[PDB]
């Protein structure tokens, strides 16, 4: 069955630039995986950050950006600032049903 | 703006039946396809299935396909999730999300997520 | 028996208008359910905000007011500030006794 | 200010009958209506009863009336809730809160609820 | 046996003074009881501020005093801060062991 | 500074029988008297007793009085706490606090407290 | 950066076995050892074992061996630890952390640690 | 078997020095336990900040410096600030495999 995996955590600092990635235990992920980005905040709140591997949410700058690189898929954050705190999950499109990451945490100091 | 509504929280009991709502600002669903996210620690997140509200038509996974349920009230704009014959590990924070991929227009917005507490 | 349902949560930005909603799973909502809501901080923190349909506690801005839209009770919050990041419960009459929504959680950003 | 007063924790066993209390700042109940709250994660907040300290007349639900119970120190300024009978799903925290409606002027203000733990 | 009952909890402004109670189930609170406040703060963090009943510890400010009124011991706080948000348990001494209170809660607006 | 200094963590299973521990900084106890406050949600804080490192001389409750224990390692600096025979109530974090009342000088300061889990 | 990547939570149940992964951004493991860090409250943290990559060479200790395992992808990059026959004790927050002592070079950096959630 | 203590937490003000310490149960720490000091913050954040009893990790100041004193490991932090508020766990090195400590955690006013 479907399994995918993405980082655990990610720390860093306002400015840098971060990459989180996710991969699929079927192959490689691919377009029609349509990966999705959905950004969780404390008390369960989440948001959908990018889908479709690389289309941005309104409301969402294009300094997040996502891709597939080799046969992963992933999440870019750019001029990271410290608002972006949060969780960043995976979800992945099996032909009529999705699959969860366990969520990569980024931090930044602070 | 545009906000998704869920119950705060809901108290079962094992082998009973019960129902979890999804609305939007919104105005209805359908069509801004719907999602059930779960959370329980560690874990973080599990998903369910979808309802098309127009006539049917939801899909789950082999393992969810028994407990599983999704629904709406179209007249009004509510979406539904019906866990029948919980257990005590049904207990947890279940999310709700839309719209989109069908794909209208093009990202999902959360809701808060109902505690669904299982049992006592 | 009576269920009270409102949106699981809401988000929004400071300055702007957000209307939470209250509908009785019995008919519509009415004056005789003198639809309260009480607003709920971390820790268990409840206070009282309006009751009545429309009536505000001694303390609050006239920004929170409350009505009945249709056959659904509302409370609109305006001119939101960060301040009123909260769960915002419905809580309903009937006859003798005292029914609860789930609670509608507001988030700012920031 | 003004405000209210309930016990920190409470450790109960299955099968014991427990008792929390509410006070005003205040000055005394009765007048200035009574409830309990009951919060369940995902559940959030359930009811439970009042009661008429000058004599007596509490109300519940159709479920609550068994374990519910409502109740005073009058010669003090205390209310109070009984749960006869306690199982591992009474386990909650419980807030208080005060008044009116019975209608005197015209505003709950909230307590900060007690964690009754059931049970080890 | 010895049951200590406190107020839940207690909101307030910076530059109030709210004055907290303690009452003991088998008489009046006395000087043989002498009456400890300590404050708990997120994490399990607790901090003797007054004992004997009206005896600062070391690093308290005079702002923090306590007393008995009538058959209740009280601590009283004057000149309310934001920093004093926390819970403040009772505990009273019966001869040979120490009686806790359920810790009334302290809030600021903020 | 002066600072009180107990373990993260300590995990035991029911029937076993474990101990915790209180230093100070500080230098050494025994003398600045020893508590040991149990916090289990709602209830908040509860007792257990004290030891006299130089000679004996504990104290609690009748119903501490079975797995009530206190002590400390003297050349060193260290105050104890032992759970004989743990259930899983006895799950739970316990704070430990020193000094004085006995009454050397002048109030007590808490150190971060241990989360005793029982059991898995 | 340099970062390490764990799964959110992951759900089994008594009896089942399941298996926690660590990636680094990074490149791989080996070389760079690896920590499994177990954390349940007051007890905090606790420990397992580590893998040899290259061609194997795991340590843990006398409680951990039945359960403990270590392992990778090093046609990737991940690092493994799976517990067979899980129970619900098993239930915490396993931490991943690596490299060196055996001592490539100097320090561990953290992972955020999956919630394994059994069961239910 | 192996015990790690150390203490249960340690409070102190931005500036100052505090000293954390870690004893083993089989008798003196020594070189070859190559004590390590693992920082922990919030949502279990866990980073490495001294090893091999005194050296430092890349990016952490030598305001953290760690020692043997006697018969224990110390953990030794001069000018303390804010962002420092953490837990402090010790790992010791016993043959083969890394023993913890409870981790001590320490408090700023703020």
């Known amino acids: 069955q479907a399994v995918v995996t993405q980082e655990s955590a990610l720390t860093t600092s306002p400015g840098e630039t971060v990459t989180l990635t996710c991969?699929?235990?079927?192959?490689?992920?691919?377009?029609?995986?349509?990966?999705?980005?959905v950004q969780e905040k404390p008390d369960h709140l989440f948001t959908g950050?990018?889908?479709?591997?690389?289309?941005?949410?309104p409301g969402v700058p294009a300094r997040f950006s996502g891709s597939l690189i080799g046969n992963k898929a992933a999440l870019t954050i750019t001029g990271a600032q410290t608002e972006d705190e949060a969780i960043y999950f995976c979800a992945l499109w099996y032909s009529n049903h999705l699959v969860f990451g366990g969520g990569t945490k980024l931090t930044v100091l602070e | 703006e545009v906000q998704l509504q869920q119950s705060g929280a809901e108290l079962v009991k094992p082998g009973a039946s019960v129902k979890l709502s999804c609305?939007?600002?919104?105005?209805?669903?359908?069509?801004?396809?719907?999602?059930?996210v779960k959370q329980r620690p560690g874990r973080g997140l599990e998903w369910?299935?979808?309802?098309?509200?127009?006539?049917?038509?939801?899909?789950?996974?082999e393992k969810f396909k028994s407990k599983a349920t999704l629904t709406v009230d179209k007249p009004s704009s509510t979406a539904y999730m019906q866990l029948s014959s919980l257990t005590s590990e049904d207990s947890a924070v279940?999310?709700?999300?839309?719209?989109?991929?069908?794909?209208?227009?093009?990202?999902?917005?959360?809701?808060?997520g109902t505690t669904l507490t299982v049992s006592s | 028996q009576a269920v009270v349902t409102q949106e699981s949560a809401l988000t929004t930005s400071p300055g702007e208008t957000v209307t939470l909603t209250c509908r009785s799973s019995?008919?519509?909502?009415?004056?005789?359910?003198?639809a309260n809501w009480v607003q709920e901080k971390p820790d268990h923190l409840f206070t009282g905000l309006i009751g009545?349909?429309?009536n505000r506690a001694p303390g609050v801005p006239a920004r929170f007011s409350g009505s009945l839209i249709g056959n659904k009770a509302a409370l609109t919050i305006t001119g939101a500030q960060t301040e009123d990041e909260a769960i915002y419960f419905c809580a309903l009459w009937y006859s003798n006794h005292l029914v609860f929504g789930g609670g509608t959680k507001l988030t700012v950003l920031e | 200010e003004v405000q209210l007063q309930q016990s920190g924790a409470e450790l109960v066993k299955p099968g014991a009958s427990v008792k929390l209390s509410c006070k005003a700042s205040?000055?005394?109940?009765?007048?200035?209506?009574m409830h309990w709250v009951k919060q369940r994660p995902g559940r959030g907040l359930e009811w439970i009863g009042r009661?008429?300290?000058?004599?007596?007349?509490?109300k519940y639900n159709e479920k609550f009336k068994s374990k519910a119970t409502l109740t005073v120190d009058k010669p003090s300024s205390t209310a109070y809730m009984q749960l006869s009978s306690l199982t591992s799903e009474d386990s909650a925290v419980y807030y208080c809160?005060?008044?009116?409606?019975?209608?005197?002027?015209?505003?709950?203000?909230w307590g900060q609820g007690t964690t009754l733990t059931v049970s080890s | 046996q010895a049951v200590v009952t406190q107020e839940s909890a207690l909101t307030t402004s910076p530059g109030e003074t709210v004055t907290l109670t303690c009452?003991?189930?088998?008489?009046?609170?006395?000087?043989?009881?002498?009456?400890?406040?300590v404050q708990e703060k997120p994490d399990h963090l607790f901090t003797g501020?007054?004992?004997?009943?009206?005896?600062?510890?070391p690093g308290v400010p005079a702002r923090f005093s306590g007393s008995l009124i009538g058959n209740k011991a009280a601590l009283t706080i004057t000149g309310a801060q934001t920093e004093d948000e926390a819970i403040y348990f009772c505990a009273l001494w019966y001869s040979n062991h120490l009686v806790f209170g359920g810790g009334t809660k302290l809030t600021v607006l903020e | 500074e002066v600072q009180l200094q107990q373990s993260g963590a300590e995990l035991v299973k029911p029937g076993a029988s474990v101990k915790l521990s209180c230093?100070?900084?500080?230098?050494?106890?025994?003398?600045?008297?020893?508590?040991?406050v149990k916090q289990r949600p709602g209830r908040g804080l509860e007792w257990?007793?004290?030891?006299?490192?130089?000679?004996?001389?504990?104290?609690?409750?009748e119903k501490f009085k079975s797995k009530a224990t206190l002590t400390v390692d003297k050349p060193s600096s260290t105050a104890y706490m032992q759970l004989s025979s743990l259930t899983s109530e006895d799950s739970a974090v316990?704070?430990?606090?020193?000094?004085?009342?006995?009454?050397?000088?002048?109030?007590?300061?808490?150190?971060?407290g241990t989360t005793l889990t029982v059991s898995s | 950066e340099v970062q390490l990547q764990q799964s959110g939570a992951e759900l089994v149940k008594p009896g089942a076995s399941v298996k926690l992964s660590c990636?680094?951004?990074?490149?791989?493991?080996?070389?760079?050892?690896?920590?499994?860090v177990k954390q349940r409250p007051g007890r905090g943290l606790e420990w397992?074992?580590?893998?040899?990559?290259?061609?194997?060479?795991?340590?843990?200790?006398e409680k951990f061996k039945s359960k403990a395992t270590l392992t990778v992808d090093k046609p990737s990059s991940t690092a493994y630890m799976q517990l067979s026959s899980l129970t619900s004790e098993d239930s915490a927050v396993?931490?991943?952390?690596?490299?060196?002592?055996?001592?490539?070079?100097?320090?561990?950096?953290?992972?955020?640690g999956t919630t394994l959630t059994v069961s239910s | 078997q192996a015990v790690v203590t150390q203490e249960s937490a340690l409070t102190t003000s931005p500036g100052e020095t505090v000293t954390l310490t870690c004893?083993?149960?089989?008798?003196?720490?020594?070189?070859?336990?190559?004590?390590?000091?693992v920082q922990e913050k919030p949502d279990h954040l866990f980073t490495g900040?001294?090893?091999?009893?005194?050296?430092?990790?890349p990016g952490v100041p030598a305001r953290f410096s760690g020692s043997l004193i006697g018969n224990k490991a110390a953990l030794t932090i001069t000018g303390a600030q804010t962002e420092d508020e953490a837990i402090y766990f010790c790992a010791l090195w016993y043959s083969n495999h890394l023993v913890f400590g409870g981790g001590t955690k320490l408090t700023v006013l703020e």
């Open positions: 809160a005060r008044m009116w409606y019975y209608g005197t002027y015209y505003f709950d203000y």
């Open positions: 009545g349909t429309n």
């Open positions: 019995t008919g519509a909502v009415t004056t005789s359910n003198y």
């Open positions: 205040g000055y005394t109940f009765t007048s200035y209506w």
């Open positions: 009661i008429d300290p000058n004599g007596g007349g509490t």
